[PDB]
Amino acid sequence: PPSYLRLSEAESKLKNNEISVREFVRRLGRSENYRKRFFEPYSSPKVVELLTKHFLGRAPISQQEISTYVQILGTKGLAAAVDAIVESPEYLTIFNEDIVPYRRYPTLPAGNYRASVRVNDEELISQSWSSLSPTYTGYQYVTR
Amino acid sequence: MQDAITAVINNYDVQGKYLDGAALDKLKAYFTTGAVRVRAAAVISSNATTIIKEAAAKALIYSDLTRPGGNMYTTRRYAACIRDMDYFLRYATYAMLAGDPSILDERVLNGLKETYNSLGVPIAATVGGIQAMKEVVGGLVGPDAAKEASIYFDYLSSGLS
Amino acid sequence: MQDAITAVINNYDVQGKYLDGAALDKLKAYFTTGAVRVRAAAVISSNATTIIKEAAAKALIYSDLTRPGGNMYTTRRYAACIRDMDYFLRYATYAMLAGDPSILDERVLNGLKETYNSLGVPIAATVGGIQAMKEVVGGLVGPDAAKEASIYFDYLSSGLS
Amino acid sequence: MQDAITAVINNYDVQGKYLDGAALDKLKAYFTTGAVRVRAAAVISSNATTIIKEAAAKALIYSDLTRPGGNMYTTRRYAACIRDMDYFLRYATYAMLAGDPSILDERVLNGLKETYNSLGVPIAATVGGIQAMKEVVGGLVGPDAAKEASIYFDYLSSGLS
Amino acid sequence: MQDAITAVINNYDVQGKYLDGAALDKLKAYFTTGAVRVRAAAVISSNATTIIKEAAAKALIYSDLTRPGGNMYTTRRYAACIRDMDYFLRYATYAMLAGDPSILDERVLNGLKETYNSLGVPIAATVGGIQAMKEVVGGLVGPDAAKEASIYFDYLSSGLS
Amino acid sequence: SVLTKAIVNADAEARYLSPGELDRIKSFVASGERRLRIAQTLTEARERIVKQAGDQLFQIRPDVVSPGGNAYGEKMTALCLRDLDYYLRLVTYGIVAGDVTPIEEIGIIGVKEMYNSLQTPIPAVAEGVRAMKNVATSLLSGDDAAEAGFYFDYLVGAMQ
Amino acid sequence: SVLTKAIVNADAEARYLSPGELDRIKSFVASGERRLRIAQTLTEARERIVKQAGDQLFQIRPDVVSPGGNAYGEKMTALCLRDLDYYLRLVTYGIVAGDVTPIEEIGIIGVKEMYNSLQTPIPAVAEGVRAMKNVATSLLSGDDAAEAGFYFDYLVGAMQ
Amino acid sequence: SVLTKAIVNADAEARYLSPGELDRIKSFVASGERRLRIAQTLTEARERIVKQAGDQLFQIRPDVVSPGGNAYGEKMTALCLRDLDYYLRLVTYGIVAGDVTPIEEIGIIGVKEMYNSLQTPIPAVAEGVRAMKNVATSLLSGDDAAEAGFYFDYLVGAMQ
Amino acid sequence: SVLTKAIVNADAEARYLSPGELDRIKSFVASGERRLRIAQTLTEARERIVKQAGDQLFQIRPDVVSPGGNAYGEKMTALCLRDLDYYLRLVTYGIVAGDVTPIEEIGIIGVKEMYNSLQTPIPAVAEGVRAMKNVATSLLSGDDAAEAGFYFDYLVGAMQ
Amino acid sequence: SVLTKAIVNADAEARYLSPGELDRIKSFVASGERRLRIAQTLTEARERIVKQAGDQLFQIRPDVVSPGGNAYGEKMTALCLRDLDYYLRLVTYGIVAGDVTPIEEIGIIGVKEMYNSLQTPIPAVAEGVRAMKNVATSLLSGDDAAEAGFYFDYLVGAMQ
Amino acid sequence: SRYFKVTACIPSLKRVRTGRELQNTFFTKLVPYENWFTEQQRIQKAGGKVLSVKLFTGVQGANTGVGA
Ligand SMILES: *C[C@@H](*)[C@H]1/C(=C/c2[nH]c(/C=C3N=C(/C=C4\NC(=O)C(CC)=C4C)C(C)=C\3CCC(=O)O)c(CCC(=O)O)c2C)NC(=O)[C@@H]1C
Ligand SMILES: *C[C@@H](*)[C@H]1/C(=C/c2[nH]c(/C=C3N=C(/C=C4\NC(=O)C(CC)=C4C)C(C)=C\3CCC(=O)O)c(CCC(=O)O)c2C)NC(=O)[C@@H]1C
Ligand SMILES: *C[C@@H](*)[C@H]1/C(=C/c2[nH]c(/C=C3N=C(/C=C4\NC(=O)C(CC)=C4C)C(C)=C\3CCC(=O)O)c(CCC(=O)O)c2C)NC(=O)[C@@H]1C
Ligand SMILES: *C[C@@H](*)[C@H]1/C(=C/c2[nH]c(/C=C3N=C(/C=C4\NC(=O)C(CC)=C4C)C(C)=C\3CCC(=O)O)c(CCC(=O)O)c2C)NC(=O)[C@@H]1C
Ligand SMILES: *[C@H](C)[C@H]1/C(=C/c2[nH]c(/C=C3N=C(/C=C4\NC(=O)C(CC)=C4C)C(C)=C\3CCC(=O)O)c(CCC(=O)O)c2C)NC(=O)[C@@H]1C
Ligand SMILES: *[C@H](C)[C@H]1/C(=C/c2[nH]c(/C=C3N=C(/C=C4\NC(=O)C(CC)=C4C)C(C)=C\3CCC(=O)O)c(CCC(=O)O)c2C)NC(=O)[C@@H]1C
Ligand SMILES: *[C@H](C)[C@H]1/C(=C/c2[nH]c(/C=C3N=C(/C=C4\NC(=O)C(CC)=C4C)C(C)=C\3CCC(=O)O)c(CCC(=O)O)c2C)NC(=O)[C@@H]1C
Ligand SMILES: *[C@H](C)[C@H]1/C(=C/c2[nH]c(/C=C3N=C(/C=C4\NC(=O)C(CC)=C4C)C(C)=C\3CCC(=O)O)c(CCC(=O)O)c2C)NC(=O)[C@@H]1C
User: Fold this and answer.
1) How far, in Å, CA of I116 to CA of A3, rounded?
2) Which chain C residues contact residue G109 at CB under 8 A?
């Protein structure tokens, strides 16, 4: 981050070992700086998969998960959803308290491998978060 | 998300132009209707559950959807339907307050049609339910915000259909 | 990804063949040009931000792109473009050191064309900036490694175009 | 955390009491000085970096702390300390706006003494820097909010000491 | 962590002093001892399982530890204990390579005594196993690096005890 | 309170207060004495409002004071009236605060578990709160009536 | 804008808008015509404000227009004046919007990398912004002058 | 190779290459001709190293060529000799490449599951590899012998 | 150092040191005495190098020793010279260590906040570092001069 | 349709249908249900397809929305989108019919004179149809995707 | 606005993980009030030991300004 968002007091709480890596990840998940960038300009089966990719490194498992996380987002908002992912057993066994999450490409969910390959490292983030000025896409050239 | 003011500021920032008489006219036109929007939003927030059960009774229940073989049968699928309905009500309130369907296109309609096709949810039935909620909201709010409430319900219905 | 040595090793392992004279000739060919690559990489690392500055001033800036309505308009989009330029220069340095375009094909060019098409990025402007940084690195590195440095910049430009 | 209004509301809700004349008088006393707090906070926000510079120049730098063997020594330690004073200034501004040191106790003082003892941080030097910042803030804000600013800086200094 | 070179550099950086002849002799001593450490490291890496399979025989197994009521009883506890031997061997190798027990204090010794007390692990048995590993390593490596290897196992045993 | 909410948002974003937050603080401190007057009026008329709210609630839902009703019996009805007085105190607290933080902390979150555990009709409590709002707005000027009714409607929506 | 901020927070918490948000929306819509008047005043006085701010900045910091200066040359000075005009337009946008979202997402985020890549003094640009603040407050009534000065001070603080 | 291991960490932290990395690349590239000459002799002695290594392996433990052994039979013994030739080729790959990336990706990752499914003695395979190390060291100069012995030692360590 | 970096990378994967990450250690110990001689040679001429670098820097950028310059005044210039001596000491530390690692923890991370808070020209400090680089390379053989210039260029890039 | 073409080529020879054409008829009737399902699926998402394909076309070929462009202006762009909707309807008709007989008679033969008289770029129309093909194939299963892509490719080649 | 200061020792008794796991097993960390219940009984379902918990930040009286 180019001297950007970061987390004031969160780096200090990490370095002094007051906070764990999982706790810092949960703090980063629930904030204005994550909500504005990964929750505003998106519909609401897709925020769930972006959140699951960022915190678990994969696509959503099955259609039944877009009942659970969808209802969590609808009723208790973004913070409860971000806490549910962090407190999920899948996060706990794979990462637990003190390892930074990473891309995984799992094998066992029967299609999650190709889903994870597509969602990360095959498709990047479109739809810039701010709605303040669109590109008018009529000037592709820098001739002079 | 963009509101009316943000949309005007967007249309002038893209051209790199200061605000002129036309932009001021649009902003003033939004400004003169602010209080009615607040009152209607408060009314809808206070009567959300009432409008939901009324719309369900008028458009959904007492039919094959609530019977075996229907889509809304079982408490889980009925809960999904009413939770979607509450989503429609709350996001319509947001769009009406902001004076823009940007929230409706952004956080509601994107991919909803394909999602409903994948799950087998009845698009016509949900459109009829949203219309029943539109009629109930128009009855509750009064003449001051009836049309401004109904326009975003119509926007939602046209997005689904 | 793969470098030249690992590429030859893999190309022989697929055939189940021992390293013979031709393969060792390829390996010695990479070994002889070692000095120019690390010196070019060190000078590029030392002059990275200056290189981006001249490349921007020479290929992108003082044009309609930086003015309102362009893609480079606003500090947000300008920071995005300059970060992309720094990214491209860094991965070109990686490819030059490794003697192989596999890393560029994997971690850079994958999906970039479609994503830029979706976001409205100017591909011609991107290619012009890449060629400008190619010119500046060719000037900086000297005669030892300018050609090798230029080949992978040409690879990135050709893959995007 | 709590402000003056929230503290009074807590003290009455613990007894299950409606607001009486004394609580109304306390609320009126807080209300009468709200604007001066706002202007002092605006001045402090506009001059935050300047206050930190003059506080550092008057209390910390040009000493053994900034030399080798000092806590200030090395850019990492120095910038961490200055980020600390920026924290102190911002949370002092929050305390001034809220009219209560509850936020200072909750988010700053809790554990800071033991943390500084473990890290080797000079508590006396931190107190001197906080007092210099308080002096600069009192000079900048003016007579209207000088004592109001000074009380929370003294609160922070007393909590650290 | 820190090796001999980094420790000397930090001990001079705290005083802000250029390096002198006294630190130069210490650095030259490590540079003389460089080859034997690298040569001894590969031997331990190749004989890691064989080394563990003898220290366990001479210190742990065929006793009440492997019987019912013992801490090493059951396959899970045995596997965890032998993984503990692998941890100790690998970090002893790292310490003997870096010429400093800083990494041993950093990543092994902190919390280990209290954790073993909480889990019921016998510290005396662990120390005996570490000493047996030290004996085997001193036998394998030869006169050249025997004492250098042994000092870090002694450090680990003293830290645990 | 508005101060609490603004300070919480500013601290969460790790920044000084925004101009919008400063403007809303200025507006709240400007409206403070009017809020104090409205709260004083409601506190002074606390008993009549509670009694009338209970009476309209009983007229609307006689089943609650029927044999299988939660508030059946004299002391059960007195408990419901005390709950209404409690909600009046919370409404006055919210009006003086300018937001709903103390109100939510004291009497909304967990209230579903309240009336599920006690088997009390939450819609009946909402209807009593509505009649309570009518009685309260009967004793206030139009702007002050709207200001109090905003918090009353907040409570009604909270019990939902 | 304030509407965007309140609605975004409400949607993030998955709830309807709070009474405090409703009150701040009402105050913002009430102050709309005054904000528009301030905006039209600044827009009509855009050239003179930029000119006076430029002269004040050049008196205070002659080094920037010196040989070792970023804005050395007539066209370099013109580019700086265009930047000052851009920031004046952004301040007008923020004043009409009632919050700092337009200024933030248009001209402050990434501006550090802006003037680091271009090697432009950020404190010098802040001084120029203060100059436009003085020139603009010279052309406004006290309440409107303070209202515009809040956004100008926000820009000054953000450019740091 | 050394290139992949010195580039992957740079990509991981996101920076250009550090001078220690560059100079270790210099040592690697300077040792290139000697590495090629080292790898050539092992390819000259390919089918003659494996015959000596097999004899020492079977003399150290003849039970694998016993009727209850995994290598019982002419074709079973030929397969084991082929695996030893495979690992000799992989050692030559590692010698020429200067690191263990090809060796790891071709013949160690999953080798435990390999030999567990085939029920082949991994400790026996380790002694088989060490025999190849001894026979290779017997036909090289001291520095080159130690250089090849490093990679043989790594294979022996990773095999178990 | 190189040893610390290699040990960190090996421990991060929970493995032993591969043959690839032992040749770098051997090359480091081989070049250790040369690095020590280079650092001691630079340490002998620390005063002359610092003085000549300061003179060259002042000739290139006299604005820093101008009234509007950070290093205006005799003591302000002495502080700049002391900073140059500090960075020469850090370069010597990096050269002896073989990896630049201690230099980051000493004087490059947070140095942006260092010089922004003191209002000192970071590009001017970079120019001074280049001046001391020229002075140092004027007093060393070709390979030694190149080896020192690698770390000097790294410090210059870090001051960017 | 397949029925139409089989009947017409049989009547060309003035003889009853051969058994092979009958197996044609059974295959076409068996595939007709899947064809109508695919066409209905494309019909449900007609607006998204045309919108995204038009955006893609304007991205690839911006000269048509340039001042010297046939579709320059908002109404000229709307006419282009209406033409794209026409072609999507024709493709759905072709998919349901199975044979491409309606598409050729409705929107293929004479389209050269179409766009020559209107001065519209036929290659640009081809690019728009290809983008429509991509967006449509994004919403279909693989066999259905190929079945639709064949007709899209006919459109692209027959507008050549 | 309330953060407990807790310390636990969770023993892994199902997999015998082969890499590090010291900080994962013994740790002291601050946990917010809204998640401390789930964290504690997650520890208890892993056979962990809750050695110590502290209130640290908030006040012990509560009921206003607490559920923020
Ligand atoms: C009147 C109700 C109709 C109906 C609906 C129905 N919907 C689903 C499932 C989903 N609906 C949504 C919608 C949203 N979730 C969100 O979070 C948002 C905004 C972000 C929206 C708009 C989604 C995503 C799902 C999938 C996940 C989930 O179920 O929560 C279902 C369930 C289908 C199933 O059983 O798999 C139903 C039944 N059904 C009717 O009969 C009505 C017409
Ligand atoms: C000279 C710069 C040109 C330019 C660029 C530009 N890019 C973006 C946004 C993004 N760029 C990327 C890039 C990558 N993602 C990857 O994974 C990789 C390789 C590892 C790359 C190169 C992505 C994903 C984005 C979108 C998300 C983000 O912004 O980080 C933008 C911003 C556009 C917007 O606001 O939507 C710009 C402007 N623009 C020009 O005009 C230049 C020619
Ligand atoms: C080429 C000289 C440039 C310059 C420098 C300048 N520096 C200061 C003051 C300080 N410099 C330091 C530096 C360090 N502390 C560390 O730990 C390290 C790493 C080893 C360094 C380099 C510090 C701490 C100070 C503060 C004062 C002190 O040392 O006690 C000043 C004085 C600024 C003032 O306001 O008085 C100057 C001028 N100025 C230039 O123009 C050159 C580019
Ligand atoms: C992607 C759009 C391209 C484009 C198109 C364009 N078309 C027109 C005008 C007409 N196009 C038609 C088309 C048809 N009539 C038919 O019967 C069929 C078969 C189903 C087609 C496709 C017609 C009839 C018109 C005339 C107006 C009318 O419909 O009444 C125009 C406008 C030209 C003008 O001079 O106004 C445009 C621009 N232009 C592009 O650049 C795209 C490649
Ligand atoms: C500054 C006036 C003095 C000084 C300070 C110093 N502090 C640290 C490290 C830390 N400081 C904190 C601070 C806080 N904890 C809190 O909860 C808050 C509120 C946000 C504060 C201000 C913490 C947690 C740490 C440790 C983590 C970190 O470094 O961020 C250092 C660095 C010590 C080191 O190098 O390890 C320093 C130097 N030093 C002085 O000389 C001043 C007198
Ligand atoms: C003026 C007081 C200061 C100053 C400025 C300066 N700026 C430039 C060049 C550019 N500035 C911008 C700015 C923006 N683009 C945006 O989208 C926004 C947000 C609305 C801003 C602020 C840009 C894009 C450029 C590049 C040229 C272009 O616009 O196409 C220069 C010229 C630098 C050069 O190398 O020529 C200068 C001098 N200089 C000073 O001295 C002041 C501190
Ligand atoms: C027997 C059919 C096979 C066989 C076995 C064998 N075992 C050992 C040594 C030990 N075995 C154990 C086993 C356990 N400890 C436990 O807690 C459990 C779970 C209930 C088991 C199964 C232990 C602990 C030892 C070590 C000695 C001790 O018990 O103290 C040996 C000796 C190996 C040696 O090197 O001396 C042997 C031979 N061998 C075969 O051939 C059979 C197939
Ligand atoms: C072996 C001779 C003795 C023995 C050991 C034993 N240890 C455990 C469990 C653990 N040991 C560790 C150790 C470490 N983790 C690290 O990161 C490091 C340094 C890098 C060390 C040294 C840890 C954390 C645990 C707990 C988690 C885990 O099980 O992996 C056990 C298991 C105890 C149990 O069943 O809960 C045992 C048996 N036991 C003996 O009898 C020997 C004297």
Assistant:
1) 13
2) 75-76, 79
What are the CA-CA distances from residue B63 to residues B60, B67, C115, G60 (Å)?
7, 7, 46, 79
Find where tokens 């260092």 sit: I114
**What is the domain range of residue J69?**
1-160
**CA dihedral of D143, D149, D154, D155, whole degrees rounded to 10:** 140
Domain C1-161, CATH class in plain words: mainly alpha
CA–CA separation, D41 vs D55, rounded Å? 18
Total structural domains in chain H? 1
Q: What is the resolution of this structure in A?
A: 3.4
The radius of gyration of chain K from alpha carbons, rounded to an integer in Å, stands at 14
The side-by-side arrangement of strands in the sheet containing K3-9 is K26-32, K3-9, K49-54
Tokens of J107: 């929107």
In angstroms, the Cα distances linking I5 to E3, H6, I21, J61 are 10, 11, 10, 51
- Indicate whether residue B103 lines ligand 1 (CB < 6 A): no
Q: Which residues of D are annotated as a binding site for (2R,3E)-phycocyanobilin?
A: 62, 66, 71, 74, 76-77, 81, 84
Q: Write down the H helix ranges in E33-145.
A: 34-46, 48-59, 75-98, 102-104, 112-119, 123-141
Would you list the domain boundaries of chain C? 1-161
At residue H127, what is the residue type?
E
Tokens coding J156: 């692209």
**Do the beta carbons of residue I17 and residue K23 sit within 8 Å?**
no
Q: Are F129 and F103 in contact (CB under 8 A)?
A: no
Quick check: G72 and G81 in contact, CB under 8 A? no
Chain G residues within 8 A of I123 when measuring between CB atoms: 119
Q: Which atom of ligand 6 is nearest to the CA of G90?
A: 20
DSSP of F20-40, one letter per residue? HHHHHHHHHHHHHHHHHHHHH
* CATH number assigned to the domain comprising residue F41: 1.10.490.20
Amino acid making up residue A91? Y
The alpha carbon of residue G8 and the mean position of all alpha carbons in its chain are separated, in whole angstroms, by 23
Which one, of F43, G12, G3, lies nearest residue A42 by Cα? G12
Roughly how many angstroms between the first and final C-alpha of chain G, as a whole number?
23
What is chain A's length? Answer: 144
Which residue among D104, D119, D160 is best mutated to probe the pocket of ligand 5, counting the most ligand atoms within 8 A of its Cβ? D119
**Distance from C-alpha of J129 to C-alpha of J159, rounded to nearest angstrom:** 10
Looking at the CA of residue I83, tell me the nearest atom of ligand 3.
Answer: 22
Distance CA C103, CA A118 (A): 19
3-class secondary-structure state, position G103? helix
Query: Which residues from F are below 8 Å from B when comparing CB atoms?
Result: 150, 153, 156-157, 160
Q: How far apart are CA I3 and CA A48, in angstroms?
A: 44
The CA C137 to ligand 4 mean position distance, Å, reads: 49
Neighbours of E23 (CB within 10 A): 18
Which residue is closest in CA terms to ligand 1's atom 29? A67
State the pairing for strand pair K26-32/K3-9: antiparallel
Most B CBs within 10 Å, among A131, A132, A136, to test the B interface: A131
HSE-CB of H91 using CA atoms within 13 angstroms: 33
For ligand 1, whether the C-beta of A70 sits within 6 Å is: yes
Beta partners for residue K49, in sequence order: K9
Q: Cα separations (Å) of B16 from G84, G86, J67?
A: 13, 8, 21
- Helix (H, G, I), strand (E, B), or coil: what is residue K56? strand
Indicate which atom in ligand 1 lies nearest the CA of residue B85: 1
Number of CB atoms found within 10 A of residue C120's CB: 19
* C-alpha to C-alpha distances, A87 to A22, A23, A60, A83, H132, nearest whole angstrom: 9, 10, 16, 6, 52
Q: Is F135 exposed, middle or buried (0-12, 13-18, 19+ CB in 10 A)?
A: buried
